[PDB]
Amino acid sequence: RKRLGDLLVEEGIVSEAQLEQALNAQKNTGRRLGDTLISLGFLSETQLLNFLAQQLSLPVIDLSRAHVDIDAVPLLPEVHARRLRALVIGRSGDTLRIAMSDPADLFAQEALLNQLPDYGFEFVIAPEKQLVDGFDRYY
Amino acid sequence: KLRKRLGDLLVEEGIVSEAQLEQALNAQKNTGRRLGDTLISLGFLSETQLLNFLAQQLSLPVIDLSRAHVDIDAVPLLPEVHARRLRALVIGRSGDTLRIAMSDPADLFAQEALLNQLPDYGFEFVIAPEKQLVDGFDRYY
Ligand SMILES: Nc1nc2c(ncn2[C@@H]2O[C@@H]3COP(=O)(O)O[C@H]4[C@@H](O)[C@H](n5cnc6c(=O)[nH]c(N)nc65)O[C@@H]4COP(=O)(O)O[C@H]3[C@H]2O)c(=O)[nH]1
Ligand SMILES: Nc1nc2c(ncn2[C@@H]2O[C@@H]3COP(=O)(O)O[C@H]4[C@@H](O)[C@H](n5cnc6c(=O)[nH]c(N)nc65)O[C@@H]4COP(=O)(O)O[C@H]3[C@H]2O)c(=O)[nH]1
């Protein structure tokens, strides 16, 4: 997979110098690169969501207007959903549609496999704020 | 799971050669040593290179902990004896999320321990050199 900074440069969203500044800043915080670029004023939140979706080849969703399957939600117990920042929003056959705010999180991906074994997975990316509101709404 | 396995990553990015990888895989068997450390022992890879490519493999950043922002109030959430055992330092807290620097974020045995030790906090992981972690323990406890 292409790295996010390189993607944003190739797409003309940030310059090489801006990317280097953010990478240097990140070495001193450990915050995510996209979040760092937003702090520096070089990237917007909407761009971050859209370009993450492009990097990972996942759809963006507006959960605030989505119609969530309320019988799919409980397949992932609340304690795990909140911890992993993941919400099961649909079930077709044995494929679950799962919204995540950090779908690039390797350890969350590993955990989800452990918590929801034997299902097919389709992922969509949502803003963390919408996920958090979703947990309150659907549990 | 699934990360790209480390050998293939290092070969594809032109860090180690195919024959060297095969040599290290052969040599690693039943030594108790992981692949990166085997490659380093054979002189094909450096500690810094291993750090940087583990970070790429695990999709996390390397930090310079000697200069990094550390919430010195967040540090004590993990008692010193556990921080030292697990080679893990809590450097940020916000809501129920902790940012944790580890020398080995691939250490799942340590991760399990960290999880049971800091329950009801979720984690964001970053990697730092072990020397910097230990200096951090001396500095923040
Ligand atoms: N939800 C969310 N996801 C985000 C954000 N920023 C980055 N990501 C996604 O999450 C992964 C980890 O980001 P990171 O912690 O900044 O960790 C990054 C970062 O430290 C660094 N990195 C990212 N892009 C570049 C680059 O163009 N050049 C270099 N040298 N390093 C890069 O390598 C690590 C892995 O990069 P990736 O493969 O791109 O993988 C990224 C990316 O897929 C964010 O603000 N929010
Ligand atoms: N802190 C630290 N972490 C390390 C080091 N070396 C590897 N790791 C990480 O820890 C996991 C286990 O390494 P392993 O015991 O060598 O066990 C490895 C190794 O025996 C083997 N492996 C790795 N790469 C290759 C490869 O390219 N070809 C083959 N045939 N086997 C491979 O598969 C197992 C799993 O590989 P991975 O998915 O890459 O998962 C690796 C990797 O993420 C190290 O020196 N220090």
Which tokens is A39 given? 């702090």
**CA A131 to the chain's CA centroid:** 10
Secondary structure element (H or E) that encloses residue A59, with its range: none
Mutate to test the interface with A, among B5, B56, B59 (most CBs of A within 10 A): B59
Query: Do B79 and B128 reside in the same domain of the chain?
Result: yes
Q: Is the Cβ pair A110, B69 closer than 8 Å? A: no
Interface check for A39 against chain B (CB to CB < 8 A): the answer is no
| Contact (CB, 8 A) for A127 and A100 | no
Query: Do A72 and A135 reside in the same domain of the chain?
Result: yes
Query: Do B25 and B83 reside in the same domain of the chain?
Result: no
Task: Give, as one character, the DSSP assignment of residue A92.
Answer: E
Cβ-based neighbours of A78, under 8 Å, separated by 6 or more: A135, A139
* Omega prior to B2 cis, within 30 of 0: yes
Last residue of a domain, one of A12, A27, A58: A58
Last residue of a domain, one of A58, A92, A107: A58
Last residue of a domain, one of A36, A58, A80: A58
How many angstroms separate the Cα of B58 from the Cα of each of A40, A70, A106, B105, B107? 25, 33, 7, 8, 11
**Count of domains forming chain A:** 2
Separation CA A2–CA B13 (nearest Å):
13
- Determine how β-strand B97-102 pairs with β-strand B122-127: parallel
Please name the method used to determine this structure. X-ray
Query: Do A63 and A128 reside in the same domain of the chain?
Result: yes
Query: Do B94 and B37 reside in the same domain of the chain?
Result: no
Q: What is the resolution of this structure in A?
A: 1.4
Helix (H), strand (E), coil (C) string for chain B: CCCCCHHHHHHHCCCCCHHHHHHHHHHHCCCCCCHHHHHHHCCCCCHHHHHHHHHHHHCCCECCCCCCCCCCCCHHHCCHHHHHHHCEEEEEEECCEEEEEECCCCCHHHHHHHHHHCCCCEEEEEECCHHHHHHHHHHHC
Torsion of CA B36, B37, B43, B46, to 10 degrees: 70
Interface check for A27 against chain B (CB to CB < 8 A): the answer is yes
Torsion of CA A52, A37, B133, B93, to 10 degrees: -80
Query: Do A108 and A78 reside in the same domain of the chain?
Result: yes
Closest partner residue to B68 (CB to CB) among A28, A84, A105 is A28
Separation CA B46–CA B30 (nearest Å):
22
Ligand 1 pocket residue status of A48, Cβ below 6 Å = yes
- Determine how β-strand B88-94 pairs with β-strand A120-125: unpaired
Q: Is the Cβ pair A106, B3 closer than 8 Å? A: yes
Query: Do B65 and B132 reside in the same domain of the chain?
Result: yes
Query: Do A4 and A33 reside in the same domain of the chain?
Result: yes
| Contact (CB, 8 A) for B133 and B65 | yes
| Contact (CB, 8 A) for B60 and B125 | yes
Domain enclosing residue A6, as ranges: 1-58
Q: Is the Cβ pair B64, A27 closer than 8 Å? A: yes
**CA A23 to the chain's CA centroid:** 20
Separation CA A42–CA B61 (nearest Å):
19
Query: Do B19 and B40 reside in the same domain of the chain?
Result: yes
**CA A18 to the chain's CA centroid:** 23
| Contact (CB, 8 A) for A120 and A104 | no
Query: Do A115 and A81 reside in the same domain of the chain?
Result: yes
Query: Do B3 and B43 reside in the same domain of the chain?
Result: yes
Query: Do A52 and A3 reside in the same domain of the chain?
Result: yes
| Contact (CB, 8 A) for B20 and B42 | yes
